[PDB]
Design a binder for this molecule. Structure first.
Ligand SMILES: Nc1ncnc2c1ncn2[C@@H]1O[C@H](COP(=O)(O)OP(=O)(O)NP(=O)(O)O)[C@@H](O)[C@H]1O
Ligand SMILES: Nc1ncnc2c1ncn2[C@@H]1O[C@H](COP(=O)(O)OP(=O)(O)NP(=O)(O)O)[C@@H](O)[C@H]1O
Ligand SMILES: [Mg+2]
Ligand SMILES: [Mg+2]
Lengths: 463, 463
């Protein structure tokens, strides 16, 4: 209706809503029972769901209520596709589909709004993982003429009827909770002077696309460190074949993808290196590195504890899916040394993205050091406000908050984020905690931080 | 946006919201603790508040989303002003202001939508009780030419700035939760081919008015049973003087209102009957019926247990405020026998309005008989659906529901109302109750009903 009118509308939905969740919090941090914990669980779920409908609806409304103002910055696109693929990776693997990204050429470093751009790709990507039962999802980006970039999310789902393709970018249009995820993309599009559309074919799949005039910051520096070298993919999955190919050729390699351990060999150069999907495992997890060939197994993070058996069988190494082009390159260049992927490093988890609020650089260092040793990707900020700045703009799985930090108190920094809408869990560090909770903080940790404390938290808030 | 789109929007806000409240219910019907009951209380409050913002916002939206269709019926206007005054009576008396209604002449029985008309008067009345700190509120209605009726809600509040008087009937316009109560009245107005407006004067008060072309069903039959008789009002309150006057003259009496026990006497006929407000009580509740005069004390329901001392002092009787013109007339005609007002009948409460769902007419009779003996005004319906019909259209304080009733199961009748938005508490009667609660029922009662059970419920859900 108006922006002033909405700013207080939000306060009035949110305030009682945070009220509910603060209460649910406190309750569960008190001895309860069968049923009497049954209830406080099923309440925090109904509450959490409603909060995401409310943020969705207010997000939508605040985007048609003013101009919007972008905070333009240099972003690494390959790094962005990867972050999104890696956030979606858990949803996809638990339905038994694949998520992967590739670029065909090096693209430029770009001047865009990282957070808003990511929001578009998450909307397309989530949709894709929700709607496909069969192959998987491919994130793609390619430069076009006019200083323009074009992002693709392709999926082996059931596709979109030809005439239904205008409909679905409108508010509260569904398949038959909000039905706003695309409406929100339609309005971030126009704010970047972009367009968005959809293709594919009914019953084969859907491609969702975004095409935005952008500012370049950089020469797409063109280092091809796989010049010469040859690489075979054996995977029965279409997405791992397509993406893994393009990732090779982006590093200046030649790629032979095959459905089969036996086909790969059949049509690939003899000096070629063999990438083999563990989806080809026969009974007992039988996977034979074909006699007298350099071979790398492609595992999902869950398949991590197979890595020892498959190195004894004579695989020279492993890659984790979705494939990082950087770790891909490091492994092929063992046609002759790289660190263990952070996603199987965890003592429990896969790689939780973590925001660290600590103002002492050296205490941050020691926290970061135990964090990255349970596979966490960690961002650090000095004070309680440029935390808020970076806990909206950001996307993260946990938030570690100092309390006696200057700028803003830990407690009023929590409160601030909880009242701003964002739902990410928050653990406090220090050496009067019942207000902490109700204020909107989920856990407490004894500072200085410790291996075994940090594990508890990683297992509790990342699964 | 659309009505189809809104019908599922509502489902999606409501469903998780009922989820929260079902859970809050179950929790509180299990042994808890200091804090661990502290929490389940403060949750059911934050939830209940949010539900009323949601119903408000969906109500508003569903009124601009279609035509609306009125269910026209014969309504008694004097009976309607009274019902509203009596619903507002508790809010007003606990801030120490007065609510009263009068008509000047008998009006016709009218063909209107009772529920929607009431909703307008509640919106105006609530506002009035919320915004006045000083005198009180007067509900008024008078016939005009064109078959038109005009309703007034006047208040000794701080009034409305002359130019602010268009503004305030718009959505999300405030004083500086929703700010929708008048927006909703603006759209029920237009649906009755009415107009609505406001008058008064800054810092003296505000009159809120509704003027609707209507259908007449009846001759305003003109029985004046106080022809001849004279009546003096002594009250320091402006509203009780104004309303109490007009109520006399509507029955064809002559009225002399005075601020004072001593002024009344000073200028009233000697044969006149004296109505004296207990707000004139001096210390210890001293109130002298002036020697050798027929006098009736006007009490608020809380002042009920003073009725014995004041009959010994020589008052011939009492009226409860806000004054019922019917009980007024019955008392004056003791210039020479009426039942005890239902509002001080309660063993605990004042008069809870109660909806009774029972299909056996004779079991309804026995329930009604204990109900009306704790001051309840009771409506009865045969089955679980024309309950829904009459628990929206209606306004009530408790709902007594049979379970093994034909038409609709008690449980799916609850569920139906809880999903329709309405918040009124619901107690079930019979001889597997944990689903009852979560389904949206608040209490259980052993059928057949009993004095002491019914008291519990009246004290728990009416205060
Ligand atoms: N990859 C896809 N394949 C097929 N249908 C899709 C795909 N992505 C989106 N849709 C359809 O597009 C509609 C609108 O999508 P969207 O606005 O994201 O709503 P939602 O995902 O249904 N609800 P919300 O969770 O708020 O995002 C969905 O209801 C689907 O009907
Ligand atoms: N009797 C009154 N005296 C003075 N101001 C009033 C009165 N009634 C209404 N108002 C003003 O009118 C505004 C709009 O009223 P309304 O739409 O009822 O919103 P609300 O009462 O503020 N919020 P809501 O509870 O949804 O009704 C209020 O915010 C007050 O500013
Ligand atoms: Mg979606
Ligand atoms: Mg109001």
């Amino acid at each position: 209706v108006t922006p002033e009118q909405l700013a207080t509308l939000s306060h009035e939905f949110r305030t009682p809503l945070n009220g509910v969740l603060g209460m649910a919090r406190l309750l569960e941090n008190t001895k309860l029972t069968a049923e009497q914990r049954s209830y406080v669980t099923a309440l925090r779920e109904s509450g959490d769901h409603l909060l995401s409908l409310v943020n969705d609806v207010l997000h939508f409304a605040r985007l048609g209520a003013a101009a919007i103002e972008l905070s333009l910055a240099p972003v690494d696109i390959e790094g962005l596709l990867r972050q999104v693929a890696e956030l979606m990776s858990p949803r996809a693997h638990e339905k038994g589909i694949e998520i992967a990204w590739a670029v065909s050429s090096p693209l430029p470093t770009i001047l865009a709004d990282e957070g808003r751009l990511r929001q578009i790709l998450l909307n397309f990507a989530g949709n894709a993982v929700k709607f496909t039962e069969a192959g998987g999802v491919l994130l793609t980006a390619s430069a076009i003429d006019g200083g323009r970039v074009r992002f693709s999310v392709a999926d082996t789902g059931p596709g979109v009827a030809p005439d239904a393709r205008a409909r679905i970018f409108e508010a509260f249009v569904q398949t038959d909770g909000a039905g706003l995820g695309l409406a929100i993309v339609s309005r971030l599009s126009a704010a970047m002077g972009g367009a968005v559309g959809v293709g594919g074919e009914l019953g084969q799949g859907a491609e969702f696309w975004f095409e935005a005039p952008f500012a370049t910051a950089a020469a797409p520096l063109r280092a091809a460190p796989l010049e010469g070298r040859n690489v075979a993919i054996a995977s029965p999955n279409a997405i791992v074949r397509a993406a893994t190919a393009r990732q090779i050729e982006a590093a200046g390699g030649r790629a032979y993808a095959a459905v089969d351990i036996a086909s790969a060999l059949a049509g690939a150069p003899a000096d070629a290196v063999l990438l083999i999907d563990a989806a080809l495992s026969g009974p007992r997890g039988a996977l034979k590195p074909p006699a007298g060939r350099r071979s790398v197994v492609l595992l999902t993070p869950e398949q991590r504890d197979r890595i020892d058996r498959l190195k004894a069988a004579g695989f020279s190494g492993y890659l984790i899916k979705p494939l990082r082009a950087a770790s891909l390159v490091a492994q092929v260049l063992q046609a002759v040394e790289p660190a263990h992927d952070d996603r199987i490093a965890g003592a429990v988890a896969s790689g939780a993205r973590v925001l660290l609020a600590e103002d002492n650089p050296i205490n941050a260092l020691l926290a970061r050091t135990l964090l990255e040793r349970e596979g966490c990707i960690v961002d650090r900020v000095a004070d309680g406000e440029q935390a808020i700045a970076a806990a909206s703009a950001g996307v993260y799985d946990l938030i570690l908050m100092d309390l006696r930090m200057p700028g803003l108190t830990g407690i009023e920094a929590a409160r601030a984020l909880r009242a701003k809408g964002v739902a990410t869990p928050i653990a406090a560090l220090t050496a009067d905690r019942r207000t902490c909770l109700a204020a909107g903080m989920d856990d407490f940790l004894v500072k200085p931080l410790t291996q075994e404390a940090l594990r508890d938290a990683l297992k509790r808030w990342t699964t």
